[PDB]
Amino acid sequence: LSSQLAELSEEALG
Amino acid sequence: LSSQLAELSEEAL
Amino acid sequence: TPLLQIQPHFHVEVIEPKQVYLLGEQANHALTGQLYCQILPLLNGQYTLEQIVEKLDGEVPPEYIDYVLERLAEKGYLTEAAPELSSEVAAFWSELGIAPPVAAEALRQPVTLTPVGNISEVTVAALTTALRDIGISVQTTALNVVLTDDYLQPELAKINKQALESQQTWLLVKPVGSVLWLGPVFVPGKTGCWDCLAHRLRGNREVEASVLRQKQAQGCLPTARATLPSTLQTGLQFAATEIAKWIVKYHVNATAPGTVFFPTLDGKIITLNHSILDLKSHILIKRSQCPTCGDPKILQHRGFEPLKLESRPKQGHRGTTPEQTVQKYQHLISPVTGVVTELVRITDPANPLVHTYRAGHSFATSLRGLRNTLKHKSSGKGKTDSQSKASGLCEAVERYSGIFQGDEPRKRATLAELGDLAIHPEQCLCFSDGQYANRETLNEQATVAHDWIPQRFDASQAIEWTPVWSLTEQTHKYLPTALCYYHYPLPPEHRFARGDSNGNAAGNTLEEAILQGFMELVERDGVALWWYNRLRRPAVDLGSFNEPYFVQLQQFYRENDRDLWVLDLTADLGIPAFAGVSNRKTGSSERLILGFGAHLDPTIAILRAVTEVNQIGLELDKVPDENLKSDATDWLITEKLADHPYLLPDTTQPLKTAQDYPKRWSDDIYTDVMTCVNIAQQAGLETLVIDQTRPDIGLNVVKVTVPGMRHFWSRFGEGRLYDVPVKLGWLDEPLTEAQMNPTPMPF
Amino acid sequence: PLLQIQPHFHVEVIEPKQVYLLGEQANHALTGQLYCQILPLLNGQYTLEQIVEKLDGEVPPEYIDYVLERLAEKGYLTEAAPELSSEVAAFWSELGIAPPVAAEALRQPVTLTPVGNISEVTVAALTTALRDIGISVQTTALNVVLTDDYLQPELAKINKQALESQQTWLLVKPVGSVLWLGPVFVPGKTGCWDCLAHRLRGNREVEASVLRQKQAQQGCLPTARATLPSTLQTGLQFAATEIAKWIVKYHVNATAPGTVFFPTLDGKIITLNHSILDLKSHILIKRSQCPTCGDPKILQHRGFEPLKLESRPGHRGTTPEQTVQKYQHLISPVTGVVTELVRITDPANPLVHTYRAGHSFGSATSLRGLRNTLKHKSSGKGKTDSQSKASGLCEAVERYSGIFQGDEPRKRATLAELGDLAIHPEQCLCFSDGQYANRETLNEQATVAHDWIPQRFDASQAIEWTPVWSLTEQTHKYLPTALCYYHYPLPPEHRFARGDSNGNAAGNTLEEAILQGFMELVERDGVALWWYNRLRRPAVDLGSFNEPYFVQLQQFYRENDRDLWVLDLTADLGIPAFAGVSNRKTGSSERLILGFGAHLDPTIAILRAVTEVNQIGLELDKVPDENLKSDATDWLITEKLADHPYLLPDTTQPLKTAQDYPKRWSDDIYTDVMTCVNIAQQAGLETLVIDQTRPDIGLNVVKVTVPGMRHFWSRFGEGRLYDVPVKLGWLDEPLTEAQMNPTPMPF
Numbered sequence A: 001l002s003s004q005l006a007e008l009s010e011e012a013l014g
Numbered sequence B: 001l002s003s004q005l006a007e008l009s010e011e012a013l
Numbered sequence C: 001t002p003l004l005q006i007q008p009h010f011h012v013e014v015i016e017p018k019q020v021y022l023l024g025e026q027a028n029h030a031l032t033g034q035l036y037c038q039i040l041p042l043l044n045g046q047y048t049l050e051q052i053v054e055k056l057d058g059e060v061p062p063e064y065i066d067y068v069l070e071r072l073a074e075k076g077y078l079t080e081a082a083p084e085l086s087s088e089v090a091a092f093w094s095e096l097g098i099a100p101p102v103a104a105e106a107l108r109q110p111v112t113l114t115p116v117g118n119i120s121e122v123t124v125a126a127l128t129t130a131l132r133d134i135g136i137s138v139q140t141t142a143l144n145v146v147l148t149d150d151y152l153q154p155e156l157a158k159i160n161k162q163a164l165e166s167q168q169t170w171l172l173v174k175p176v177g178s179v180l181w182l183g184p185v186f187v188p189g190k191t192g193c194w195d196c197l198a199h200r201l202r203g204n205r206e207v208e209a210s211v212l213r214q215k216q217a218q219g220c221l222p223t224a225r226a227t228l229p230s231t232l233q234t235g236l237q238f239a240a241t242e243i244a245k246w247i248v249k250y251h252v253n254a255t256a257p258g259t260v261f262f263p264t265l266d267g268k269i270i271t272l273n274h275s276i277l278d279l280k281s282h283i284l285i286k287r288s289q290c291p292t293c294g295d296p297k298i299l300q301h302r303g304f305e306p307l308k309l310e311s312r313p314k315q316g317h318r319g320t321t322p323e324q325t326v327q328k329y330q331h332l333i334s335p336v337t338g339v340v341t342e343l344v345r346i347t348d349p350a351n352p353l354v355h356t357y358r359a360g361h362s363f364a365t366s367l368r369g370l371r372n373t374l375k376h377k378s379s380g381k382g383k384t385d386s387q388s389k390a391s392g393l394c395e396a397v398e399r400y401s402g403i404f405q406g407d408e409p410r411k412r413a414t415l416a417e418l419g420d421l422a423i424h425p426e427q428c429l430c431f432s433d434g435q436y437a438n439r440e441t442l443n444e445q446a447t448v449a450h451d452w453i454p455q456r457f458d459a460s461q462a463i464e465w466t467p468v469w470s471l472t473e474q475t476h477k478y479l480p481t482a483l484c485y486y487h488y489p490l491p492p493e494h495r496f497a498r499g500d501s502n503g504n505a506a507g508n509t510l511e512e513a514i515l516q517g518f519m520e521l522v523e524r525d526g527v528a529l530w531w532y533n534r535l536r537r538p539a540v541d542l543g544s545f546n547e548p549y550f551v552q553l554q555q556f557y558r559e560n561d562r563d564l565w566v567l568d569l570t571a572d573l574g575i576p577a578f579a580g581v582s583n584r585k586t587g588s589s590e591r592l593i594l595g596f597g598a599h600l601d602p603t604i605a606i607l608r609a610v611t612e613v614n615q616i617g618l619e620l621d622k623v624p625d626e627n628l629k630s631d632a633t634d635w636l637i638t639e640k641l642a643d644h645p646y647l648l649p650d651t652t653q654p655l656k657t658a659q660d661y662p663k664r665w666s667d668d669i670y671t672d673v674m675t676c677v678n679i680a681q682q683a684g685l686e687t688l689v690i691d692q693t694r695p696d697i698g699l700n701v702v703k704v705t706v707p708g709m710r711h712f713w714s715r716f717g718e719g720r721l722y723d724v725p726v727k728l729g730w731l732d733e734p735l736t737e738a739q740m741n742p743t744p745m746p747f
Numbered sequence D: 001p002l003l004q005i006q007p008h009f010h011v012e013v014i015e016p017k018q019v020y021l022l023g024e025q026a027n028h029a030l031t032g033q034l035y036c037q038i039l040p041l042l043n044g045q046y047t048l049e050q051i052v053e054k055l056d057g058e059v060p061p062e063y064i065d066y067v068l069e070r071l072a073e074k075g076y077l078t079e080a081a082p083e084l085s086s087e088v089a090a091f092w093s094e095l096g097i098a099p100p101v102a103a104e105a106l107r108q109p110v111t112l113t114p115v116g117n118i119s120e121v122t123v124a125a126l127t128t129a130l131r132d133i134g135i136s137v138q139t140t141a142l143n144v145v146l147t148d149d150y151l152q153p154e155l156a157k158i159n160k161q162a163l164e165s166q167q168t169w170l171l172v173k174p175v176g177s178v179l180w181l182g183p184v185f186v187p188g189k190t191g192c193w194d195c196l197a198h199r200l201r202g203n204r205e206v207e208a209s210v211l212r213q214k215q216a217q218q219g220c221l222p223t224a225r226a227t228l229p230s231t232l233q234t235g236l237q238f239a240a241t242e243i244a245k246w247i248v249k250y251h252v253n254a255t256a257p258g259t260v261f262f263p264t265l266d267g268k269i270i271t272l273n274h275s276i277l278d279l280k281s282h283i284l285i286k287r288s289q290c291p292t293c294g295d296p297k298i299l300q301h302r303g304f305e306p307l308k309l310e311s312r313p314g315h316r317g318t319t320p321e322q323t324v325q326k327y328q329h330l331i332s333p334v335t336g337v338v339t340e341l342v343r344i345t346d347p348a349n350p351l352v353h354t355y356r357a358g359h360s361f362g363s364a365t366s367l368r369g370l371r372n373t374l375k376h377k378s379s380g381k382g383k384t385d386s387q388s389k390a391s392g393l394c395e396a397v398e399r400y401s402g403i404f405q406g407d408e409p410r411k412r413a414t415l416a417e418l419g420d421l422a423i424h425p426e427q428c429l430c431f432s433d434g435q436y437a438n439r440e441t442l443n444e445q446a447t448v449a450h451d452w453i454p455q456r457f458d459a460s461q462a463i464e465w466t467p468v469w470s471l472t473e474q475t476h477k478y479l480p481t482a483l484c485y486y487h488y489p490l491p492p493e494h495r496f497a498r499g500d501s502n503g504n505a506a507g508n509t510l511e512e513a514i515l516q517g518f519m520e521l522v523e524r525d526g527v528a529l530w531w532y533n534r535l536r537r538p539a540v541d542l543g544s545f546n547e548p549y550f551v552q553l554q555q556f557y558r559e560n561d562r563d564l565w566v567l568d569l570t571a572d573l574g575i576p577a578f579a580g581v582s583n584r585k586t587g588s589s590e591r592l593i594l595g596f597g598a599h600l601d602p603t604i605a606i607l608r609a610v611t612e613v614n615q616i617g618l619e620l621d622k623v624p625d626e627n628l629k630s631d632a633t634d635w636l637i638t639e640k641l642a643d644h645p646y647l648l649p650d651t652t653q654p655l656k657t658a659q660d661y662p663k664r665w666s667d668d669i670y671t672d673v674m675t676c677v678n679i680a681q682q683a684g685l686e687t688l689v690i691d692q693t694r695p696d697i698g699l700n701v702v703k704v705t706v707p708g709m710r711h712f713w714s715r716f717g718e719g720r721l722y723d724v725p726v727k728l729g730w731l732d733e734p735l736t737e738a739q740m741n742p743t744p745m746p747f
């Protein structure tokens, strides 16, 4: 898919 | 010194 | 349609090129990707999905958007706003992980309030207001909230039973007084009940317990007097918050299980002290034993069923570490729900050699009877802080587990109708006939309290007999219950025994405990022989053992005005047993102090002895002579080493060394136990075990008894105290009762 | 006038001679028959003259005074206050404060100042809560600040004014899921708000970072969104109780200085988490160097003053438990420096002890950089539980003390003008001219981040130099400040260094810390000579040392699918240095892990090494190879023993033993240091020390530097890395740069 959809990432910080 | 008054003591449990 | 918003607790901050940070009070998150920076600023809950397209239409396709919101929904950053809730409220539940609309449904369940005791209807309403202001209907249920001025109000019993019968969950709160009590949430068939809590409370409210005894001779009392309207409102509001948390958790864990976990008050008590400012969590254990909700016949059955032992490989001979043992029994340390009031390191941490701890548990019909308790605090012994802490905790659990609760295994009978299965209490006590004759006179002149001489046992009277397991004969014998457990109530005219702590021991397993118990007996027996026959014993060469600790500790005493030595007390059982002795060189008083111990491993046995010296001795050294509050005051101040030449070592004999103490231990604690019972057998002694373990406690506790073996208290009946020394050639002929040491063993 | 016994006591009378005084926090027993007669007239409903009348023909009034006097003497007695209710009276008496005094104290007024987004209604509610307990607000002896965040910039101004005005004031955050309460600032006595703030900025690196990122695209963020009206009210009311307590304590203290003891929020911050439910007390330290209230100019002076060492007789001067105790207060995520200190390993393991310590340094200007901070945390290493705890705590404090604050000893100059005393950074870094030429290409492709190569030093540029102390030559030298502290900000076109942790160490005394630092240097130097030359070293017979931990530990690994051996890295200094190595015998990967350690005592040296193998490798074996986010991930998964023969011991050489390592240590730590400096001198090396200690911390922290000695990172400059192996006969001829180990040391 679009790189814009591939780059999506959600992470928590500890 | 008296008895009634002597026996008086106070203490923390 | 519904507004779309990112979780309300999160504060949105866009860092334009690629990142957007979701900052929260307890958690922070970071998102990556252009689309987020473009799309998220519209997820503040002011746009509908139909509305969102137009603003960015021509910039982002709709299909794209859906995928973005799709991934946001899956991963739980995305929610729909709830009209019923304010933004601040919505933020509270979403921060727990609960989408606002689920909470709105959750809060909808009503609640009932019930005042009990001296709680005002005004105060009830005050809570009603507090609860209502966060969206909780209150019925004239899913939860009953009880307000008390004291957790031991008799009215609570009736409620608890009502809860149990109707399977009704409920909550207890005490907002008045200087200590807020919040919780627990009782869940019938799941958590503990009030009675389970009450059983622990009654034990931890000792003065009150006696004062209620003294008074009714000639249910609870109001300690809750200190109350500000602020500390009152603080408790009620705090209660409301927690009530809401219970409702909402209960709702979501069913509606959406495993997605969100935060702690509620279930099976927990929270105490907030308004005066000194300290919050403490207390754990309520469900008692399989209690009459109100469990099965009180549990201990009854266990006692009358055979003891079953089993192999316990070792890994300092125990089956677990102290750090571990403490861990799984920390929760027992609590003056509210717990059996141990506190666990404090009494000694300086900058000392690497001496580690002593302090423990609690309060157990009286009188003030003078009251004074002795509150002074009886269990204490920790160790070579390490870890062990001292583990011992201090486990000794406390030990004493508690031995206290007669009323559910113990028993049956009423006479010595006659039991026959050879029964054991006469004189076999265990070993009081001489003269002591029994001059009872009152002797007990009147009481240098020491533990030397109390009980009434004669009247064989004609029917008493309560508790089954004990004999390891020698592998079957059930019987002792009078009065000997098995602490504070068994006897009639005033048949006070033939006070249960003692001799041979009582805790452990991570039964076999581990039985071993320590058995060894406690050998310890006392050897001391008894030595002390009362006033024998001269050989010193031990501490250096000959591959354990530096001994000679280091020696140097520590030496640098603190004290000499330290160890005598060999090993008697006819051959088990290594010692006594540590220390005196102050300089000053008004010698301050003689003693420590004993016995173990198959002589290294450990000595270690036990020398540590018993530390706990008793070094701390009291600080004090000037006058102030000593100890029971051993008259001993510590007056007595001399020169008056007690049996204390210092015999220079006639050679020093004992590590090679003088053969090895009889194995890699298995069970084998060690069975080795012990055999040693007793060789000496014509029977080894008996009563299991004092309490299901709600877990930690194993037992009382070991070996009828005939001597206690180190002033007991001069015929037996081992006289014969064993002659049998060992330590004496050429037995001493007479009159010749026995008139000075009692003060520790 | 009217007389009562302390109103927080329920008074119970046991008829013959006993009266029990029952409090919530305490209990008392009164002995005496007269006490029973009099005390029911001490409820606060009777006057002396009415007292004496009631008993006329019962007690002598002359006697009564003797009771009253003695009750007053012992302090169970007070004059009742008509102003207050019994409950309110009871509260203050339970704190040990008389009712008439309390009433007088509460008459005092206060100011409330909101800041940030606190509602006027919120201020009204607090005002009301204060009113309801009898406190009034002036629209002073105390100023109460309401905030939504402790770093709201307006607080800086309120603080300076308070300092110049000598205004005592209180801070409170009642909004948000976490109630912050306190401290009470008392200018000239208390910690500063700015000195609190200094701690806080560091603890919120993520939040602090976001603003930096925000300014680049171009002082606090409002996260206090989660708020129930019950939590809000819980915080205002709670605060009101504490406000009163301060007022009352303050009032009395003026009249009778030091007479009251119950705690106040003076210098404390209380955090009550509403969501997870936990209350913690956070101690605020007054920073001697606080620009706002302290003297920031201190650290400058001390840097340019000589270093005075004075003798101090596991050599660590005091117990780990003692070191922990006194420096515990730094373990707070608010006022503290260490975020936490948690046991990572199972307590049931008496061999492996590893503590995680939360850590707070990060200047990351990007998310990627933010990932790396938070990731990297200091850690605890020990043979025992207690030792590991101190290590983790002291290591965390070690790093913080190193972070460049901006008040470090400095002066701006160039190498030429400083000259002889100046020291050139390439003497320390020891990079090759090839490395410096291929920075961008080499740095661009690296498996390890610490192998970064700085831009070359530009001697023409003025820089800030920090005065270091030379122990060899006993005078001041100078290094670029960029090497002496962490995160020194350098221009983008002159990033000639990144301050590393090599040589850094903490200690209870300077000499202790310097000693550990020197050994850290020797450790690294040893590893460098071994690793990058790929030398074949001898193993160490761990049984030849009178310490079983090694042998037991080895067995542990076997049971956990591993081998553990130790190599000798002792180089030309002759200081015992070792490498612990271990490989897994099964699994998907071999998981090679390393640990290093140096000490004058070779037993300690080996112990350091092997414990650093536990610290690193053991926790990870629990993880499948696909979850590893360690920096040494690639190493752990793909690398193999066969490919690195310099890891396993050379069977050509004999095993080292305890007798191969001469004793060069004494009974003095100062003497040990002076030995190390002279061992370094005979090798032609100068020994330098910078005191990184912080007055607001206490625990000594230093960075030792010995120019020429190698780091175990990939730094192939000319010097010892090439020469030392030849001088010892480990090689016949020096290796070339092209022959050095292409694989970086991964840990």
Ligand SMILES: Nc1ncnc2c1ncn2[C@@H]1O[C@H](COP(=O)(O)OP(=O)(O)NP(=O)(O)O)[C@@H](O)[C@H]1O
Binding pocket: C318, C321, C322, C325, C380, C381, C382, C387, C390, C391, C392, C394, C395, C398, C501, C504, C505, C506, C507, C508, C513, C516, C520, C612
């Ligand atoms: N590591 C441990 N694990 C389990 N139980 C333990 C442990 N250490 C001690 N205990 C228990 O705690 C008690 C230890 O007391 P101890 O330190 O040996 O003093 P003591 O001399 O036996 N009692 P006393 O003679 O009356 O002062 C016994 O009940 C043991 O069973």
Ligand SMILES: Nc1ncnc2c1ncn2[C@@H]1O[C@H](COP(=O)(O)OP(=O)(O)NP(=O)(O)O)[C@@H](O)[C@H]1O
Binding pocket: D316, D318, D319, D320, D323, D379, D380, D381, D390, D391, D392, D394, D395, D398, D501, D504, D505, D506, D507, D508, D513, D516, D520
């Ligand atoms: N009892 C103690 N008193 C003072 N400081 C201590 C104590 N124990 C450990 N430390 C400190 O904590 C560290 C102990 O050694 P260690 O934990 O191995 O550090 P390290 O090897 O420098 N860490 P690393 O750089 O990852 O190898 C040093 O920084 C010491 O200064």
Ligand SMILES: [Mg+2]
Binding pocket: C504, C505, C520
């Ligand atoms: Mg015992």
Ligand SMILES: [Mg+2]
Binding pocket: C520, C523, C596, C597, C612
């Ligand atoms: Mg004992």
Ligand SMILES: [Mg+2]
Binding pocket: D501, D504, D505, D520
């Ligand atoms: Mg280090």
Ligand SMILES: [Mg+2]
Binding pocket: D523, D596, D597, D612
């Ligand atoms: Mg190291």
Ligand SMILES: [Zn+2]
Binding pocket: C192, C193, C194, C195, C196, C287, C290, C291, C292, C293, C294
């Ligand atoms: Zn129950």
Ligand SMILES: [Zn+2]
Binding pocket: D191, D192, D193, D194, D195, D286, D287, D290, D291, D292, D293, D294
């Ligand atoms: Zn300051």
